[PDB]
Design a binder for this molecule. Structure first.
Ligand code: HEM
Ligand SMILES: [C-]#N
Ligand SMILES: [K+]
Length: 250
């Protein structure tokens, strides 16, 4: 999908392979796979198709970006990774955060998302306001994923399935609790819970519920609730696409 992968040195590639292993162990032990996937989404997602500036280029590490109200918790995620990152000084932060997202999906039992190295760390972040609003609906999803990032309606629904792991926190976003009964297991339960209604102890954001009422998003929700393999396929496709917005002269 219009992507040309940069050449990196044999030493860079070796660090990638070694960092991936250390990330597995670290992330599994710390139980922070959801936060790492969220960090990856944010580090990819401050991308714009209308300006082509900022986003998946080591920019999330800057304290100017960790300030935002959609960024509560992203500071924690960056901090958790600092010591590991210091073991692999050759790797760009951009690649490191995307590798962490790929690993987060993998060690929670999700699909193996292909990873290619070579994202450069850019010197200035994008503007605050591009990123997601849980209180909004389908027009908003299409604005953040479609218009800004060039992703398709299928990507939108698949990627929303990221919420199958993790939870909201009253002190971060203000929302609270896991979307699923197994929030460290990457499966299609996000979609099953979304369809089944609101359960005691389980979260649905207005942005999740937007998927149910949209003529295009809904049949996809039905498909993924019915077929985890179809979910895994489309999820891996969309995660790779998202992770690579930071590549290839866009
Ligand atoms: C569709 C637009 C989206 C909106 C409005 C949204 C909103 C939110 C909110 C409000 C939280 C809770 C933050 C907190 O209180 O800790 C959250 C958490 C999370 N998000 Fe999203 N999100 C979106 C898309 C995505 C995507 C595309 C992914 C990855 C594929 C993702 C992955 C996650 C994960 C894994 C968590 C759990 C974080 C944790 O457990 O600490 N989200 N999201
Ligand atoms: C979701 N952030
Ligand atoms: K789950």
């Amino acid at each position: 999908s219009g992507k040309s992968y940069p050449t990196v040195s044999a030493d860079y590639q070796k660090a990638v392979e070694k960092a991936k292993k250390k990330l597995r162990g670290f992330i599994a032990e710390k139980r922070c796979a959801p936060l790492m996937l969220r960090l990856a989404w944010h580090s990819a997602g401050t991308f714009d198709k209308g300006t082509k500036t900022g986003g998946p280029f080591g920019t999330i590490k800057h304290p100017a970006e960790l300030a935002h109200s959609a960024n509560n918790g992203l500071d924690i995620a960056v901090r958790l990774l600092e010591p590991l990152k210091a073991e692999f000084p050759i790797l760009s932060y951009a690649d490191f955060y995307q590798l962490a997202g790929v690993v987060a999906v993998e060690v929670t039992g999700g699909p193996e998302v292909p990873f290619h190295p070579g994202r450069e760390d850019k010197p200035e972040p994008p503007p605050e306001g591009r990123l997601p609003d849980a209180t909004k609906g389908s027009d908003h999803l299409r604005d953040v994923f479609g218009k800004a990032m060039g992703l398709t309606d299928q990507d939108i629904v698949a990627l929303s399935g990221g919420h199958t792991i993790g939870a909201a926190h009253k002190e971060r976003s203000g929302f609270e609790g896991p979307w699923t009964s197994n929030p460290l297991i990457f499966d299609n339960s996000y979609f099953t819970e979304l369809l089944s209604g609101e359960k005691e102890g389980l979260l649905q954001l207005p942005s999740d519920k937007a998927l149910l009422s949209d003529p295009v998003f809904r049949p996809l929700v039905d498909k993924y609730a019915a077929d985890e393999d179809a979910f895994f396929a489309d999820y891996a496709e969309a995660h790779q696409k998202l992770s690579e917005l930071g590549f290839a002269d866009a």
